[PDB]
């Protein structure tokens, strides 16, 4: 297959229209075929991309997801927490089956020399299962235990979602 212009085979090259109500149809989408030739992705922008709303969530809930990347089929990230006591427990609560089950991954303290003495930041890394059926949902949220209380980042009630293939 190879490019050829309409001039070359006798037809008009150009077709010019001079210028100066809605109608509805129903369509079977299998009768049109894909124009594209041919993994996992995050279904949310990193909360930290918009600092003002990240600050708003972080100061309202005392915990907020800071950064999150999907490295291979492993999800890795950083969580920010308000430094209310000395001992803390930061957990990622994640599901690979639309919340029929979940598991609690423990997060890790990061030295983080700069970042103030008002917040601390924790890391996490979670290996996704090798095979996940396509109809299942992958979602996760964040718990922060400190000072006799529990705090949650649940992304304003939608959870952080990850979508497949």
């Amino acid at each position: 297959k190879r490019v050829v212009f309409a001039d070359s085979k006798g037809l008009s090259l150009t077709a010019i229209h001079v210028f100066s109500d809605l109608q509805f149809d129903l369509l079977d989408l299998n009768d049109i075929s894909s124009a594209l030739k041919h993994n996992l992705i995050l279904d949310f922008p990193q909360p930290s991309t918009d600092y003002l709303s990240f600050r708003s969530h972080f100061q309202k809930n005392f915990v907020c997801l800071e950064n999150c990347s999907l490295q291979e089929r492993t999800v890795t990230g950083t969580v920010k927490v308000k430094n209310v006591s000395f001992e803390k427990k930061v957990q990622i609560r994640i599901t690979f089956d639309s919340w029929k089950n979940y598991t609690d991954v423990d997060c890790v303290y990061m030295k983080n020399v700069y970042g103030g003495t008002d917040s601390d930041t924790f890391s996490f890394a979670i290996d996704l299962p090798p095979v996940i059926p396509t109809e299942q949902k992958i979602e996760f949220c964040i718990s922060y235990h400190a000072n006799g209380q529990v705090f949650w980042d649940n992304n304003d009630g939608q959870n952080y979602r990850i979508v497949h293939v």
């Binding site: 297959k1 050829v4 085979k9 001079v18 594209l36």
Partner: protein, 284 residues
């Protein structure tokens, strides 16, 4: 999010800020799920800059067929200078969400924050909605793909070639989301121009990127076994313009460009056999 209520409202000529936010998030996830160097299968209609001239985009669809009656590929520059960037980009993202494998959007040099802050889009967002919406649009734009190869024969991008581009794997390695730098491969693909009076590469009068002559185009095509460069970044009077003996073509789909000009708009229709023709909007 109800896509069909939105497309319905847009095609009657007002949208809530959350509908627009929704279009941005959903389209962003789609853009990331598909390659950054799209590999497309003709038949195909390829269009140049729209620059917010929404009624002229609607005319483009009236003439070339509303989606998915025809497949489209857009070479960037959706949102500046004109009077209706918001409507233009919302119809395009709505259609990308509705027919994600038959509607394609490439990134042009005006889908960058450093540019559309200055030439009008930010002002439209600020007046009609608020700044946060423009920040969301910017994160969306950072995920647009950069170039397309139709049927292993036509190479499409918004600006043109780059003196760094030895193989396509460079383009495929570019990570998203990303801003456009002031120099380098991604910059050149959105900013560089052909010039008839240049042997090889030279400086670019806009102060960004470079300029390439016909010999750069022919050597490129032969190295990659390609047939036609298809780009779209500068007004041309007839709507389309040939270069290097029909080895490159410039498309520009916004007629009477912000009233300063008197140019026609054009769009290239390529059928299954890779036979190309042009469809033009000449104003009165």
């Amino acid at each position: 999010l109800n896509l069909d209520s939105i497309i319905g409202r847009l095609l009657e000529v007002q949208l809530t800020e959350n509908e627009i936010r929704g279009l941005c998030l959903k389209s962003r996830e789609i853009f990331l799920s598909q390659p950054i160097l799209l590999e497309l299968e003709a038949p195909l209609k390829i269009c140049g800059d729209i620059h917010g001239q929404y009624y002229d985009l609607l005319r483009l669809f009236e003439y070339g067929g509303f989606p998915p009656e025809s497949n489209y590929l857009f070479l960037g520059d959706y949102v500046d200078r004109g009077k209706q960037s918001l409507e233009t980009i919302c119809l395009l993202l709505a259609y990308k969400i509705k027919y994600p494998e038959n509607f394609f959007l490439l990134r042009g040099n005006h889908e960058c924050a450093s540019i559309n802050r200055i030439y009008g889009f930010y002002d439209e967002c600020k007046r009609r909605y608020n700044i946060k919406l423009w920040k969301t649009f910017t994160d969306c734009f950072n995920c647009l793909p950069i170039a397309a190869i139709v049927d292993e024969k036509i190479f499409c991008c918004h600006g043109g070639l780059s003196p760094d581009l030895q193989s396509m794997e460079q383009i495929r390695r570019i990570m998203r989301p990303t801003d456009v730098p002031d120099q380098g491969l991604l910059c050149d693909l959105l900013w560089s121009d052909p010039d008839k009076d240049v042997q090889g590469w030279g400086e670019n009068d806009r102060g960004v990127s470079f300029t390439f002559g016909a010999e750069v185009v022919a050597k490129f095509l032969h190295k990659h076994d390609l047939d036609l460069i298809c780009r779209a970044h500068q007004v041309v009077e007839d709507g389309y313009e040939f270069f290097a003996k029909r080895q490159l073509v410039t498309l520009f789909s916004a007629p009477n460009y912000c009233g300063e000009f008197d140019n026609a708009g054009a769009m290239m229709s390529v059928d299954e056999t890779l036979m190309c023709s042009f469809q033009i909007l000449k104003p009165a």
